[PDB]
PDB file of C-alpha atoms in Angstrom:
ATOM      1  CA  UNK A   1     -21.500  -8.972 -14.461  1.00 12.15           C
ATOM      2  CA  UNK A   2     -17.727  -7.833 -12.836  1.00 15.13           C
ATOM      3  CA  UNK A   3     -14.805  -7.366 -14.495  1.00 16.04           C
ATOM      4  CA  UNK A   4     -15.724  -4.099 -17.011  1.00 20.12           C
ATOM      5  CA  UNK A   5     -13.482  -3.811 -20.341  1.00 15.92           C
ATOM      6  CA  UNK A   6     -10.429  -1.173 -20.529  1.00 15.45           C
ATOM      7  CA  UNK A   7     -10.166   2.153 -21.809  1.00 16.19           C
ATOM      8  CA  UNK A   8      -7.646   0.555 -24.817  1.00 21.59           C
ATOM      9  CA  UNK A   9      -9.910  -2.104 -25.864  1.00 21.72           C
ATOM     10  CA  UNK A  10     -10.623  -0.494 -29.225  1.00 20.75           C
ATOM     11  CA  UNK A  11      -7.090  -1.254 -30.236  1.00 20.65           C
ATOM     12  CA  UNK A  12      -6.386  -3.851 -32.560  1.00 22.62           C
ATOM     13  CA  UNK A  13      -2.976  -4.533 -30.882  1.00 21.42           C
ATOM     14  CA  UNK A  14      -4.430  -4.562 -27.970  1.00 20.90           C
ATOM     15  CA  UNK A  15      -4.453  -7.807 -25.718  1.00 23.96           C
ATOM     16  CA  UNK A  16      -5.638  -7.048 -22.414  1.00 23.80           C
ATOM     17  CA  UNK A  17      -4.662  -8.807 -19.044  1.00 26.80           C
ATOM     18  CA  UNK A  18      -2.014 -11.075 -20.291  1.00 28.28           C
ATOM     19  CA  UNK A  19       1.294 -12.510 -19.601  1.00 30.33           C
ATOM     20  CA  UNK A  20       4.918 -11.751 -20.691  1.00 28.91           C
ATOM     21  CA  UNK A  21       4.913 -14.915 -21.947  1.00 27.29           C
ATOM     22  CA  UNK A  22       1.567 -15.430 -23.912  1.00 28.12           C
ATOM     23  CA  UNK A  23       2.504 -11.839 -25.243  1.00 26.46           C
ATOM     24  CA  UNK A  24       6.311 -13.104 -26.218  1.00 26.97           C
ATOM     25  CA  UNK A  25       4.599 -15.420 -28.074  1.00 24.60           C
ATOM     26  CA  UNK A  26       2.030 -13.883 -29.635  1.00 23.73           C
ATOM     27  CA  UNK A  27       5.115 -11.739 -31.331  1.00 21.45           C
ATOM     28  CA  UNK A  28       6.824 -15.312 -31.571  1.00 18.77           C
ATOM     29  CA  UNK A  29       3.999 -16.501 -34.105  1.00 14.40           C
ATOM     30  CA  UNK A  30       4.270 -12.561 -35.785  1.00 12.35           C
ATOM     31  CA  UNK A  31       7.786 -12.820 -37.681  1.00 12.64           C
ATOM     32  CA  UNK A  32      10.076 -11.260 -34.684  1.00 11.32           C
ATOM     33  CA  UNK A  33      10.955  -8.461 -37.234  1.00 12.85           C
ATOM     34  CA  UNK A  34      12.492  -5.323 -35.713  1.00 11.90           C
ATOM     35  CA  UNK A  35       9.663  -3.007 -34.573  1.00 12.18           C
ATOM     36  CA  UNK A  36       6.839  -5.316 -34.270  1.00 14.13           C
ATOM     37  CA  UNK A  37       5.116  -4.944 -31.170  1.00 11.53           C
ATOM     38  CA  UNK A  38       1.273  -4.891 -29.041  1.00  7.23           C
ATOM     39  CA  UNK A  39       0.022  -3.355 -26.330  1.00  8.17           C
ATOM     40  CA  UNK A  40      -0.978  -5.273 -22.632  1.00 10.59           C
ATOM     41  CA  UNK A  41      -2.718  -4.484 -19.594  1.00 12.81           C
ATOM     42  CA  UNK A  42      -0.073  -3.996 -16.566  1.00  5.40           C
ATOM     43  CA  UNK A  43      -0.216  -6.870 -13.987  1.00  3.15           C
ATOM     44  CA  UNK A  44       1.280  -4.290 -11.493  1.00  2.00           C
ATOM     45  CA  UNK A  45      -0.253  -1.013 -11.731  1.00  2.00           C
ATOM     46  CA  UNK A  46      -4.101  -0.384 -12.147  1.00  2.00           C
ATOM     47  CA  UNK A  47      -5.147   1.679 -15.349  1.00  2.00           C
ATOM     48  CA  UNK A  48      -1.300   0.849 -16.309  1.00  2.00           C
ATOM     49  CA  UNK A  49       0.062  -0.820 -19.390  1.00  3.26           C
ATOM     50  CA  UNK A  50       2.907  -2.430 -21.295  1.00  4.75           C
ATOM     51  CA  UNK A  51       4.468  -2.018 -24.364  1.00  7.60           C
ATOM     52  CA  UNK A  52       5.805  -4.981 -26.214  1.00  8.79           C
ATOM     53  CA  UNK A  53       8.031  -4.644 -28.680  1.00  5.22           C
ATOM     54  CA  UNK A  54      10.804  -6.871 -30.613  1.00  8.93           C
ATOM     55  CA  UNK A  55      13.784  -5.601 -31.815  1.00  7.85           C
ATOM     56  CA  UNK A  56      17.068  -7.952 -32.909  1.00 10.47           C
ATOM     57  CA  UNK A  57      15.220 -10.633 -32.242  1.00 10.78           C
ATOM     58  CA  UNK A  58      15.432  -9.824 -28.811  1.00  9.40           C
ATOM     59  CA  UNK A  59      12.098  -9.177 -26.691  1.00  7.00           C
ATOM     60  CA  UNK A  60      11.860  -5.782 -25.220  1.00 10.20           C
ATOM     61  CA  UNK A  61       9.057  -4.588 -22.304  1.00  7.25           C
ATOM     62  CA  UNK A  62       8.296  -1.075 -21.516  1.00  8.84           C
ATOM     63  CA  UNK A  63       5.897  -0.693 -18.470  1.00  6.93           C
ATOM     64  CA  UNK A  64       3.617   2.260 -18.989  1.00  5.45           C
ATOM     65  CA  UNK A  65       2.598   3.820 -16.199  1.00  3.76           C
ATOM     66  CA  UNK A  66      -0.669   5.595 -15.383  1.00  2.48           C
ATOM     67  CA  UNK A  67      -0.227   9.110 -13.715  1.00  4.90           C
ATOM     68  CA  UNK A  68      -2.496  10.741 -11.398  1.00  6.68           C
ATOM     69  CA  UNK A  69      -3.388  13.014 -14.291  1.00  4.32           C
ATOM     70  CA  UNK A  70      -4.622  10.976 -16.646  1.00  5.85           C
ATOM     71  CA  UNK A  71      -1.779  10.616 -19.191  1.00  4.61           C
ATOM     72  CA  UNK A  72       0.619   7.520 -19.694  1.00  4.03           C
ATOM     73  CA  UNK A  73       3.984   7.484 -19.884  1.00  5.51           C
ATOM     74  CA  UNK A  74       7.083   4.958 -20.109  1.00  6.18           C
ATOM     75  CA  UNK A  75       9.623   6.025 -17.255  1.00  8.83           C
ATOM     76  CA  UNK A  76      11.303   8.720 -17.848  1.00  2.09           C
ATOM     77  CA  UNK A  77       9.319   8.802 -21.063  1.00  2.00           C
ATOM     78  CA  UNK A  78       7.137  11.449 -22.395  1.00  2.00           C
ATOM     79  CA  UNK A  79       3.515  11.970 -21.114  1.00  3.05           C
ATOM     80  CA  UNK A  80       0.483  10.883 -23.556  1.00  4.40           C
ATOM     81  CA  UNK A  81      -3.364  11.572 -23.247  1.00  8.51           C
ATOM     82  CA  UNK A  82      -3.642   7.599 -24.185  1.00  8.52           C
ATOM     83  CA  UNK A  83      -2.262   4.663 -25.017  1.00  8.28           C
ATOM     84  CA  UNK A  84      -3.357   5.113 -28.409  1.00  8.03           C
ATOM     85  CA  UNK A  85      -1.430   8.202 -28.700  1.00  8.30           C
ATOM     86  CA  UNK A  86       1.456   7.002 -26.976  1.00  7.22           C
ATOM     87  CA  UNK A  87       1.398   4.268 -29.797  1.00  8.02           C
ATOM     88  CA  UNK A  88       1.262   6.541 -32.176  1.00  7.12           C
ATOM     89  CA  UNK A  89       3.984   8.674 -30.825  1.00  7.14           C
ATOM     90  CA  UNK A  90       6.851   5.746 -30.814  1.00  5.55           C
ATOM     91  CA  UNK A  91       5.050   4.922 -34.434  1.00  4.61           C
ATOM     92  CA  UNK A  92       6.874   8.485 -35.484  1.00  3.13           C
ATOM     93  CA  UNK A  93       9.793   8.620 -33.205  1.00  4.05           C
ATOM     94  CA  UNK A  94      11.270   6.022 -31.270  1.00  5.77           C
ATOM     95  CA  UNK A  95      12.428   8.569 -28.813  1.00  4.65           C
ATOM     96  CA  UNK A  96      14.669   6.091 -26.476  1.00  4.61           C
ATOM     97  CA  UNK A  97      13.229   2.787 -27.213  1.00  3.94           C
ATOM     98  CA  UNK A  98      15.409   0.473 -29.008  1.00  4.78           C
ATOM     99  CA  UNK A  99      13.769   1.076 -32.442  1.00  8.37           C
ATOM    100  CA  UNK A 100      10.048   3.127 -33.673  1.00  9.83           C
ATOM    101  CA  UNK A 101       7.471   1.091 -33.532  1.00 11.93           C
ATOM    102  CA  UNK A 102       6.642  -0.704 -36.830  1.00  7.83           C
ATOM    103  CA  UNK A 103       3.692  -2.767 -38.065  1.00  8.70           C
ATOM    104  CA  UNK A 104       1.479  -4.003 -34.988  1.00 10.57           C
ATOM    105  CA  UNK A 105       0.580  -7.418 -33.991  1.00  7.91           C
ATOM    106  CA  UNK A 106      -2.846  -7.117 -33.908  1.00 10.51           C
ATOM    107  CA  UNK A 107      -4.326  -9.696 -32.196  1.00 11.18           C
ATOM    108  CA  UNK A 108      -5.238 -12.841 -34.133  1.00 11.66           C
ATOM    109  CA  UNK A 109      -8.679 -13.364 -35.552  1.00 15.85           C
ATOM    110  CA  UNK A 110     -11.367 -14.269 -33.198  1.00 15.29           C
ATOM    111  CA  UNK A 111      -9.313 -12.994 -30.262  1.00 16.05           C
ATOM    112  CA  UNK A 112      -9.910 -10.105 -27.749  1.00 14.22           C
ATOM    113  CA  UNK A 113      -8.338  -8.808 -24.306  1.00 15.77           C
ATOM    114  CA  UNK A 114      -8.763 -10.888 -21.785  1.00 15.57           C
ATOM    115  CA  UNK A 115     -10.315  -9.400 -18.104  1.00 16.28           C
ATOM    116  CA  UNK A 116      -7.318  -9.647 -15.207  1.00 19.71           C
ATOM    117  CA  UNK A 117      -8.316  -8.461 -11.689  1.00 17.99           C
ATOM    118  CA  UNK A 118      -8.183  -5.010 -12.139  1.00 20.83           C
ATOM    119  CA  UNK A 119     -10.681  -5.426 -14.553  1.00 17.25           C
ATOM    120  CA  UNK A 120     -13.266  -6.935 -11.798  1.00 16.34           C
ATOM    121  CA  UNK A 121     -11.893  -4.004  -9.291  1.00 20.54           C
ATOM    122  CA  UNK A 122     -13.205  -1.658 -11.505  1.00 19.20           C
ATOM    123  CA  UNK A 123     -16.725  -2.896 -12.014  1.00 19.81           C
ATOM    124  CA  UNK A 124     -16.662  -3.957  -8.429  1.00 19.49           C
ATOM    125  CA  UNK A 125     -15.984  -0.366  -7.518  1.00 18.35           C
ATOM    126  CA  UNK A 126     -18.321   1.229  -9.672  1.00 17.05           C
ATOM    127  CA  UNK A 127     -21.326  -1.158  -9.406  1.00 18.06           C
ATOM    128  CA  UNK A 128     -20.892  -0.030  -5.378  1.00 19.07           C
ATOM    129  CA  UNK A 129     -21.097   3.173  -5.558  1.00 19.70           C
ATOM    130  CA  UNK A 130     -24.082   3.130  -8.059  1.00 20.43           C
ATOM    131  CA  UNK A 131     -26.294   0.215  -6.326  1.00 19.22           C
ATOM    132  CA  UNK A 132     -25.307   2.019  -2.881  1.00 21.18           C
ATOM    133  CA  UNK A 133     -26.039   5.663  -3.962  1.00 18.73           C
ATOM    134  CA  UNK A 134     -29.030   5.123  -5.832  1.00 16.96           C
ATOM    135  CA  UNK A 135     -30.276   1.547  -4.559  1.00 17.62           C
ATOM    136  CA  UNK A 136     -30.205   0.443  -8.460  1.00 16.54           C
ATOM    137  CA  UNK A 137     -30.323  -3.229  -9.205  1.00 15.64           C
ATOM    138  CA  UNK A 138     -30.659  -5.796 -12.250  1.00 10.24           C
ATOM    139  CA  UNK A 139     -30.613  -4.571 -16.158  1.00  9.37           C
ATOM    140  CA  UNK A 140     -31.039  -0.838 -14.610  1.00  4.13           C
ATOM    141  CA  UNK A 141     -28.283  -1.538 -12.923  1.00  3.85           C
ATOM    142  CA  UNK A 142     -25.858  -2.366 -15.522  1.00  3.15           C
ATOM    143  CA  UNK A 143     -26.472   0.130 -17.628  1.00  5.39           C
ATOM    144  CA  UNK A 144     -26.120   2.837 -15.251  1.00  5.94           C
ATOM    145  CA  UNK A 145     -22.456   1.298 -14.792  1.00  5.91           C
ATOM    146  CA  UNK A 146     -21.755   1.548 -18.400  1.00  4.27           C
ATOM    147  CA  UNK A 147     -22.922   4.937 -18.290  1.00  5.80           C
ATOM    148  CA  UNK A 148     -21.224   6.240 -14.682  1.00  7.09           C
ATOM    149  CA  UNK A 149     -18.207   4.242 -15.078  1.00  3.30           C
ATOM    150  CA  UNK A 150     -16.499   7.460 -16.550  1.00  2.17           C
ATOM    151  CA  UNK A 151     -18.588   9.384 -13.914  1.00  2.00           C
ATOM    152  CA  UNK A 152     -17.578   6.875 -10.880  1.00  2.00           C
ATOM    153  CA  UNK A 153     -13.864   6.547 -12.046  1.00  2.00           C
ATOM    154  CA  UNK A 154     -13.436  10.329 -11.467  1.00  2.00           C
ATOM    155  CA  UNK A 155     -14.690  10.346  -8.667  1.00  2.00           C
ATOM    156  CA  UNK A 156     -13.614   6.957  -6.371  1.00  2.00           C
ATOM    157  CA  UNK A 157      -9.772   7.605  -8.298  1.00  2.00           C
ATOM    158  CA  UNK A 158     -10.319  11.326  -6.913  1.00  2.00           C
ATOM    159  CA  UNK A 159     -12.457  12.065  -3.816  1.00  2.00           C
ATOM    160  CA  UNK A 160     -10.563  12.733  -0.598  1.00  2.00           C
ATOM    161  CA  UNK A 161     -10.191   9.598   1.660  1.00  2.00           C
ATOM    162  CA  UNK A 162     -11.739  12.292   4.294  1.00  2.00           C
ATOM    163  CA  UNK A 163     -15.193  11.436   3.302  1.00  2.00           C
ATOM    164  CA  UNK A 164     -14.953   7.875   3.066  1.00  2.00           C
ATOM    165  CA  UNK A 165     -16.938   5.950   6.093  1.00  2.00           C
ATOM    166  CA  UNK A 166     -13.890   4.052   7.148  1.00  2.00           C
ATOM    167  CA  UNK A 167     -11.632   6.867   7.236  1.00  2.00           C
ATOM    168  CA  UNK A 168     -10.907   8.030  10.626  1.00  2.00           C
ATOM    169  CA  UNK A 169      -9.004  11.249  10.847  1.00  2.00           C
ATOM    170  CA  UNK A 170      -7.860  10.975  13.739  1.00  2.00           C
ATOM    171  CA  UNK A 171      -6.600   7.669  15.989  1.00  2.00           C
ATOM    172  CA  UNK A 172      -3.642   5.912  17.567  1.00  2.00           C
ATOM    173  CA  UNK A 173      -3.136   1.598  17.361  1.00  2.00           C
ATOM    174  CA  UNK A 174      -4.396   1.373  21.061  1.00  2.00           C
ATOM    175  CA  UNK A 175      -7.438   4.563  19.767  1.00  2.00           C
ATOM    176  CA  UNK A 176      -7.964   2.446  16.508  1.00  2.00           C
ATOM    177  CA  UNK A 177      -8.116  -1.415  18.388  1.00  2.00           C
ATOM    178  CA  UNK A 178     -10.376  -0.275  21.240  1.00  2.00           C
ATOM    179  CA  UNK A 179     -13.258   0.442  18.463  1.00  2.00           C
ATOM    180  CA  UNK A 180     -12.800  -2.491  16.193  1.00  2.00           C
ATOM    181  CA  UNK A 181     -13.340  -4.263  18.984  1.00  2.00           C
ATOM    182  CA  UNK A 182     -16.346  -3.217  20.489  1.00  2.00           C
ATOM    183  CA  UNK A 183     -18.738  -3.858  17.811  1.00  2.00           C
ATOM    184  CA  UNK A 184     -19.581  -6.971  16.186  1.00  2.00           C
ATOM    185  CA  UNK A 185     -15.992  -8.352  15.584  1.00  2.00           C
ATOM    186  CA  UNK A 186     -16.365  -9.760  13.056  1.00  2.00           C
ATOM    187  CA  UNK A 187     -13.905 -10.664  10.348  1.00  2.00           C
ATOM    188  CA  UNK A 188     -13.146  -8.426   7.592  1.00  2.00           C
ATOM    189  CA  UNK A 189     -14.158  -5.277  10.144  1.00  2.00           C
ATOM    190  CA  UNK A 190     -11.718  -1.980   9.302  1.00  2.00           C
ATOM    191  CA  UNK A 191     -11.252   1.277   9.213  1.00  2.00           C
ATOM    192  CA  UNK A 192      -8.358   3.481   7.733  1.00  2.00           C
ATOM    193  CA  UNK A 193      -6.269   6.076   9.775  1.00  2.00           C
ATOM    194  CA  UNK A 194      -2.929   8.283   9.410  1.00  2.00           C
ATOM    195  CA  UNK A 195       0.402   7.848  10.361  1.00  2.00           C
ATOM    196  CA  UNK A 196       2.839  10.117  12.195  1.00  2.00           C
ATOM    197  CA  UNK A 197       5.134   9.674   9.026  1.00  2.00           C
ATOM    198  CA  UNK A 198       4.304  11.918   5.830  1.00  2.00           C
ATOM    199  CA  UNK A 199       2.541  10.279   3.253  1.00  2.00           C
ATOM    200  CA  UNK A 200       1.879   7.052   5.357  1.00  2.00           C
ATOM    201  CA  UNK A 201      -1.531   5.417   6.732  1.00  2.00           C
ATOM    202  CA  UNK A 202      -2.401   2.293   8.769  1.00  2.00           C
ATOM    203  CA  UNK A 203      -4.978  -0.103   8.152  1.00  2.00           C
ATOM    204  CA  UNK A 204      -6.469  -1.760  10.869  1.00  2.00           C
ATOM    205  CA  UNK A 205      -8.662  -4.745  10.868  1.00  2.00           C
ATOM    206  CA  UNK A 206      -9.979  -7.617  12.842  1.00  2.00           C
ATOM    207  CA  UNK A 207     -10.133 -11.067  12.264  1.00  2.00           C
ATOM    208  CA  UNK A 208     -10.554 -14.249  14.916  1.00  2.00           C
ATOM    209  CA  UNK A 209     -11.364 -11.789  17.026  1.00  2.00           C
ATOM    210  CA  UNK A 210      -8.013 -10.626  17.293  1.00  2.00           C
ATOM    211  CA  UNK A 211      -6.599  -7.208  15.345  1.00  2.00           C
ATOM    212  CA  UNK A 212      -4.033  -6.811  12.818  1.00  2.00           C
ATOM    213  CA  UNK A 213      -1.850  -3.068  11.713  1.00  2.00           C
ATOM    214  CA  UNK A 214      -1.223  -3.163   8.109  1.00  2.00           C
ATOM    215  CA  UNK A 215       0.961   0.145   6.810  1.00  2.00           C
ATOM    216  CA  UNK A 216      -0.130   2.161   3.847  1.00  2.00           C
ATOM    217  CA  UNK A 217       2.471   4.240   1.866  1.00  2.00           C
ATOM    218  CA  UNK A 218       2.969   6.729  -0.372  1.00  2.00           C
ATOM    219  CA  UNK A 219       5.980   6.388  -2.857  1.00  2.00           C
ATOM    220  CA  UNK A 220       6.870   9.787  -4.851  1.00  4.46           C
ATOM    221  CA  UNK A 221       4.439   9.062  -7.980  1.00  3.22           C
ATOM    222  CA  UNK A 222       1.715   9.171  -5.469  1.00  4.27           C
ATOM    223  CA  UNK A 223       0.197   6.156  -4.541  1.00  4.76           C
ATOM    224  CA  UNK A 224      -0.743   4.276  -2.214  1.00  4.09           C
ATOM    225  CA  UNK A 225       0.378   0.176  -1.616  1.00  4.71           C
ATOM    226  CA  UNK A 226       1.095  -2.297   1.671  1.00  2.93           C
ATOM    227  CA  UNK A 227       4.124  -4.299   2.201  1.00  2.40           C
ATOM    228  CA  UNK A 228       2.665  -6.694  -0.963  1.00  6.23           C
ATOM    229  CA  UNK A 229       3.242  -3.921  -3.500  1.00  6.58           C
ATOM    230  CA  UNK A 230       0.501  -3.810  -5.656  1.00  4.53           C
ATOM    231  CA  UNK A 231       0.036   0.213  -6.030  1.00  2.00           C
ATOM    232  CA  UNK A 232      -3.165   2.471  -6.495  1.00  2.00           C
ATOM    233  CA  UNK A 233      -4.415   6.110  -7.146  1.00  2.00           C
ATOM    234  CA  UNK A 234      -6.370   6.087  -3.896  1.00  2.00           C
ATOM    235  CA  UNK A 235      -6.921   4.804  -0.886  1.00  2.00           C
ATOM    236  CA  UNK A 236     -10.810   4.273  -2.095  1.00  2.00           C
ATOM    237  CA  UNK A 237      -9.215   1.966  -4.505  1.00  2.00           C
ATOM    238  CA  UNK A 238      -6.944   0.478  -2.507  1.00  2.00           C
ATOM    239  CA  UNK A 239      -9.898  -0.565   0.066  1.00  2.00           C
ATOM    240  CA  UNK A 240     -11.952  -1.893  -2.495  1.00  2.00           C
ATOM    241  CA  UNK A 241      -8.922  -3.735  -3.996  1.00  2.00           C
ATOM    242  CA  UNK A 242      -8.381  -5.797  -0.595  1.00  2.00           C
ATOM    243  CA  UNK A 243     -12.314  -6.941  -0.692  1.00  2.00           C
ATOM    244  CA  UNK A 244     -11.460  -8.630  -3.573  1.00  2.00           C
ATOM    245  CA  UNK A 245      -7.819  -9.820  -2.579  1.00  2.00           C
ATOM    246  CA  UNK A 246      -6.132 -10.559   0.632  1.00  2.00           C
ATOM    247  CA  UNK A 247      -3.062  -9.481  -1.308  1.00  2.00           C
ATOM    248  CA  UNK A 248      -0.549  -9.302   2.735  1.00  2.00           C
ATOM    249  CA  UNK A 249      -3.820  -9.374   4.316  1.00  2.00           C
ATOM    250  CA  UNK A 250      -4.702 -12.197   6.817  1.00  2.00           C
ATOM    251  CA  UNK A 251      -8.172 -11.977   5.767  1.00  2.00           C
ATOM    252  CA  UNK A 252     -10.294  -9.860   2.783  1.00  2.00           C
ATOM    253  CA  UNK A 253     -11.926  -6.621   4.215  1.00  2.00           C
ATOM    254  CA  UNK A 254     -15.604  -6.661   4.454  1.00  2.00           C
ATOM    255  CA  UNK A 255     -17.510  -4.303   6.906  1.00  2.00           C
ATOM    256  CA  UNK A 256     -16.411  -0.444   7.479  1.00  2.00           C
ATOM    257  CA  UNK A 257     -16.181   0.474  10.587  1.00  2.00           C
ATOM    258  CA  UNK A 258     -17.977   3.592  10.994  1.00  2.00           C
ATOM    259  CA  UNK A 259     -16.705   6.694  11.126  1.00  2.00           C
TER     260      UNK A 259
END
């Protein structure tokens, strides 16, 4: 059962994994009076959001961003514990937005957010590390990721990439090549190592036999991306984000090489 349901789903204004333009309008078939708005899942940045709101007539969209910490916050915004309470917070003081945030367009009847791909990630992620640290399967299984979700979040958006099997701590492109390629080269095969530049890690994997350098960065909020863009908390996350999508990649990672 992938794709698990997000931390705002409670929200009545709330519509999940959707486009600008299924979310213009939504607010399109809501009147378009000043301070309308709802609340949608980030295509960009994992655990992020946006906040729609209309104003003038005029469409207006606020990424929210999800900090290392925990709290959300529009940039150059104020930090909140949620998006509930970031809500809230615009409800009573429109503090730089074009307008407070009036009357919400809840989501029409019968509706409810819809699962993107972050969604999957984090089910993917957690039903892992469950089924692989404590061999659980079926209906056992899937309640043990309701209940460790919380658990497994803090600690695959928080461990140190130190401990993770394909993390090696120590080894150059010709170090890193020589070992992918005695094993079972096979596609998907990769490990994780740093790069002389602060803040900056390579991954390396094989496919056709043949291996392939991708750079990791850092940018100043803290996480981690490739060349494609998409941006994450952790490496962890990162690693289990390319199984699912080749997002740069020539090919989807599969096997760890071990450390």
């Amino acid at each position: 059962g992938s794709h698990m349901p997000d931390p705002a789903a409670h929200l009545p204004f709330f519509y999940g994994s959707i486009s600008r333009a299924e979310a213009e309008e939504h607010l399109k078939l809501a009147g378009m009076a000043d301070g309308l708005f709802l609340l949608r899942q980030c295509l960009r940045s994992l655990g992020g959001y946006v906040l729609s709101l209309v104003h003038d007539v005029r469409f207006h969209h606020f990424p929210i961003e999800r900090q290392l910490n925990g709290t959300y916050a529009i940039a150059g915004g104020k930090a909140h514990c949620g998006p509930a309470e970031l809500c809230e917070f615009y409800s009573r003081d429109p503090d730089g937005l074009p307008c407070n945030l009036r009357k919400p367009c809840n989501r029409p009847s019968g509706l409810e957010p819809q699962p993107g791909v972050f969604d999957c990630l984090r089910d993917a992620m957690v039903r892992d590390y469950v089924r692989q640290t404590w061999k659980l399967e079926g209906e056992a299984l899937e309640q043990a990721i309701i209940s460790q979700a919380p658990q497994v979040e803090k600690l695959i958006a928080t461990t140190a990439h130190e401990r993770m099997p394909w993390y090696h701590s120590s080894l150059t492109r010709e170090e890193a090549e020589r070992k992918l390629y005695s094993g079972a080269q096979t596609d998907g095969k990769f490990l994780l190592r740093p790069r002389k530049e602060q803040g900056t890690y390579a991954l390396s994997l094989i496919y056709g036999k043949t291996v392939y350098h991708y750079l990791i960065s850092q940018d100043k909020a803290g996480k981690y991306c490739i060349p494609e863009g998409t941006k994450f908390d952790t490496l962890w996350q990162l690693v289990e984000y390319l199984k699912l999508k080749a997002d740069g990649l020539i090919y989807c990672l599969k096997e760890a090489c071990p450390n």
